[PDB]
Design a protein around this nucleic acid. Structure first.
Lengths: 109, 107
DNA sequence: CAACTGAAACCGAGAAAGC
DNA sequence: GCTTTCTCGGTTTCAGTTG
């Protein structure tokens, strides 16, 4: 019983993250924005709030104690999805080289 | 992987300007010609950078479109970030006819 | 945006950590 | 076990510069 699976579902269903949307009706495939940050400018990442949310939920960032580190927050979730058996990247559907890019992930039941 | 690979390339002697500058095999000269300039030969001047792109798997002959400028960027940035290589900027001459950088190898 | 650059952001994968 | 994070060694983009 790991924490990432259900947490991530709740974030997509909430609709609080601009580009974090379902791609099918079954709610088993979804898009996650993935844009290369600027030099100390992480607002172009329309889902930067998502990476912060994961460090908050997991306690890896406690506001007022730790120094903000968005680049690291992004690496923690990248490595988390890669090593997860609950998610497989649909590399054929991922779109990294467009004006508003995203990865595509599917949920293994 | 980089430290031993670049040693082997210098030892090999396949690269005309890539030579040792001392007996201890701890300081070496690496050619660094600008691609647009007039005395630039695409074959030998891009050879070492391509060798690195091939060795690591980035470039694949007959499969990928050549991109010499990238190959050069790869190795430049790999030397900067490596703590196995510090540049001796006072010994480097990048603004002459036969330009070169100079690097020391930390053991 | 041709070639080029330093610095920052980025990456996979194995070891380490945590549960 | 069973899942996330840390460490390592380069790699690629960022925001310009001609290094």
């Amino acid at each position: 019983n790991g924490k990432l699976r259900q947490w991530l579902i709740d974030q997509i269903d909430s609709g609080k993250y601009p580009g974090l949307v379902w791609e099918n009706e079954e709610k088993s495939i979804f898009r996650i924005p993935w844009k290369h940050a600027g030099k100390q400018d992480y607002n172009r990442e329309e889902d930067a709030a998502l990476f912060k949310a994961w460090a908050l939920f997991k306690g890896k960032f406690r506001e007022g104690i730790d120094k903000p580190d968005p680049p690291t927050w992004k690496t923690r979730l990248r490595c988390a999805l890669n090593k997860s058996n609950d998610f497989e990247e649909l590399v054929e559907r991922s779109q990294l080289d467009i004006s508003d890019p995203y990865k595509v992930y599917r949920i293994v039941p």
